Paper text:
The motility of the human pathogen *[name]* is driven by a complex flagellar motor in each cell pole. The *[name]* motor contains three disks: a basal disk composed of FlgP just below the outer membrane, a medial disk composed of PflC and PflD, and a proximal disk containing [name] and [name]. The distal spokes and rim are composed of [name] (spokes) and [name] (rim). Around the stator complexes, one L-shaped [name] binds one [name] via its flexible loop, locking 17 [name] monomers into a continuous rim that holds 17 MotB dimers ([Fig fig4]).
To determine how the spokes interact with the rim, we improved *in-situ* structure of the spoke-rim complex at 12 Å resolution by 17-fold symmetry expansion and focused refinement ([Fig fig2]) in addition to solving a single particle cryo-EM structure of the PflAB complex at 3.23 Å resolution ([Fig fig2], [Fig figs4]). [name] is mainly composed of tetratricopeptide (TPR) repeats and can be divided into two parts by a β1-sheet (aa 386-390) ([Fig fig2]). Notably, the last 5 C-terminal residues form a β2-sheet (aa 813-817) that makes an antiparallel β-pair with the β1-sheet ([Fig fig2]). [name] consists of the N-terminal β-sandwich domain, flexible loop, and C-terminal 17 repetitive TPR repeats. The N-terminal β-sandwich domain and flexible loop region (16- 163 aa) are resolved in our cryo-EM structure ([Fig fig2]). The β-sandwich domain of [name] is made of four pairs of antiparallel β-sheets and here named [name]_AMIN_ for its resemblance to the AMIN1 and AMIN2 domains of PilQ in T4P ([Fig figs5]). Interestingly, the long loop of [name] (126-163 aa) wraps around the N-terminal extended TPR repeats of [name], mainly via hydrophobic contacts ([Fig fig2] and [Fig figs5]). Overall, the PflAB complex is akin to a “wire-wrapped pendant”, with [name] (wire) looping around [name] (stone), forming a tight interaction ([Fig fig2]) and assembling the PflAB spoke-rim ([Fig fig2]). Deletion of the β2-sheet from [name] results in complete loss of motility ([Fig figs5]), supporting a structural role for the β-pair in [name] ([Fig fig2]).
Numbering used by the authors:
A (entry chain A): 15 to 163
B (entry chain B): 178 to 451, 462 to 820
Write the structure that this text describes.
Amino acid sequence: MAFELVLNTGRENNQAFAVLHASNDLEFTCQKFITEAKVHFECDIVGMVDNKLKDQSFSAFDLKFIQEAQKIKMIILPKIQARMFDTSQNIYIDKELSSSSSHKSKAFTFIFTPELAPIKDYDGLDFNINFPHESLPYVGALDLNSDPV
Amino acid sequence: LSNYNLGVSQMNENKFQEAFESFKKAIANGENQSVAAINAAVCALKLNDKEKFRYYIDLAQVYLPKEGKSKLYDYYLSLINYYKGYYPEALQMLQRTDMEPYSDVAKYLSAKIYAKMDFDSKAIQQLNSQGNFESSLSLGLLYARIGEYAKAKVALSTAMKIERDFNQSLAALTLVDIKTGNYQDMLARLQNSYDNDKDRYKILDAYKIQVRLNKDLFNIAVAQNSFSKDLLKKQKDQFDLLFYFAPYQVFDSKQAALYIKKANVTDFVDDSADLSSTNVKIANIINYALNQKLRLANQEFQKLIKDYPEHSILHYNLALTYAQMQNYELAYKHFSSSYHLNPKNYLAGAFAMFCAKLIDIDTTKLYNEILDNIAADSNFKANMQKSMLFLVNNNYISMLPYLDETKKDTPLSLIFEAIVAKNNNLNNQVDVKIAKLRSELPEDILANILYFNSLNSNLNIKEYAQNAQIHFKNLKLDYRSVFGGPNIAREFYVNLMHIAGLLNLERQKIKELINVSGAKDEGILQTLAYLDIFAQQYEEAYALYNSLIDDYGAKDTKTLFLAAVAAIGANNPNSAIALLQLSKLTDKNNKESKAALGMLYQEVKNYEAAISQYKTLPNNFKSEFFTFDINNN
């Protein structure tokens, strides 16, 4: 199984915080079909050969799998507002942070949180911000217990 | 002194293998398992080995609960989530770290994460809340992304001093200066950085740009604000409206009246300019001009002038046809010729100054000439021209006496009175002047639009749109032939339909009319092209404009400019360059064509010619038609 989902849930203020990470060895696609006031997050995966994959129901989103001939369609129905991100680039090595709004990569992150904000329109230049100071972070000097001197 | 301490103490000396071995020894001994695992993973990542990095990062988690009581627990968890690609978790967990030397690092990493996920404001706030790392370049880039160029310039200028961030900050500041409109500042900055010429071209090669149409053209709110409140409060609009209603000069009005079918002949023809064949030719071409056929009349006047090259009236008529056609330089030429061949034609001189003001040129000599000729005359029965002479200067008090005169009513007089009343905040008599104007001209598009905008001005957007829809629903227009006069009538009709959100239905109506039969006139095609440009349908507009140029005669400055606009909309930078060069060949000092040409040359990567066009622009100029965006792919 070269394709992996991980789910992490948590609390912020008094809300819900769901994060779904999808990864594969090859590049696959995910899109944000809107329909009518009901976002359906649809992912296309080559999948190689897979067995019967049962569908689970979760607090913030529902999952569905469709298995065609050597093709997998992942359907995500969010019960709350959801957003998509392409966290394929390794930030912890790189200094030129690219854009996270891409429709094809080897790692995708879906975020579910009730108290979100609508995307605003800013008249600006789509620069790639350069962070030149902290590239490979590490922990400094410590004692026999994990605590700074 | 400890194994972990010894490893980390070697590790900041840029010695990675020995430190990694020390970390392995510390992990084997069993001292500070989690932090040793994280540092060993980062050391392994210093060299080129991804598998070992992944193995050690995965191993780091299983010892984490052992160090459950540690004031740096938040930082360790955030780092572990940071190297695994789980970024939102790391961002959510990084805000709880309040230790002394790591709070700034936590805030910097949070800024990185926010910047990745397109939350620029939070990233700016996090970077500003930091006082350990110099984040001038990142702050400037983020400010540019948000759209606050005023602080972006300061941040980038601060970052320019450091040697490492020289080239990138220079390129970013150059692009920001282009975006804001300060061109001479950009050129001065470029000239003081390098001494060679190739090096200065490489700064413009850092970021690839892409030309785009301005988003402010399609905003309904701004169009309504500028249309229903400041219709006559603009020099270009004032001059265009004066040109529309201006009269056409003849020798004898009585002879010309028998050759024109308008029912308002006495209002659009004047004989104040101090052969029978010349009279009849003038009358025929004027009839062609007034009955919604402008291009053919302009061509006929141009052809007939070559036969008789000394007649003050003919130059005025050709110049008027050019001026109503948004061809201002030839209008200047022929207006000046007309005034120089007869210095008692004051309307010709006034229109010459108007045209010379619309393009960029000095006209003080002409103003003094007409002023001297005014002060030395036996009679001055024409005071309208004297009042009009003040319009070039940005003063309006001087025409206040004109509103108290015993006057014959012609549409030029009414529109001039409306301009004068509106420009002195006398917003009450504007309505009565416009009402009289509409009463004078029943079957006119522009009069109807003006009356509607005067009557329904004091409303909101929704009421304006609903009234407009109701008003034009019951209004029937012969679309085939009525949009064939001066360009301002179409432009204003398209703008009003854009405000009311009705231009899609009108677009469908005009298409159906076009598809009913075959070859037709120019007016419908130009109106449909303009509607397509204003409906964000660029491919059809570009095809229509190419058909206009290559099928009928469309070698005009305005038509070529609009074709270039459509081509830029349809992602054709190469054709836009040729079209804009051909447009500029006549109107040399066109401030909007030059900026677009410079941007297009920068996009095609021709920096030798990009600076040439930028060198001919002022330090304060915001193009209302073109902008650029950074191409990241």
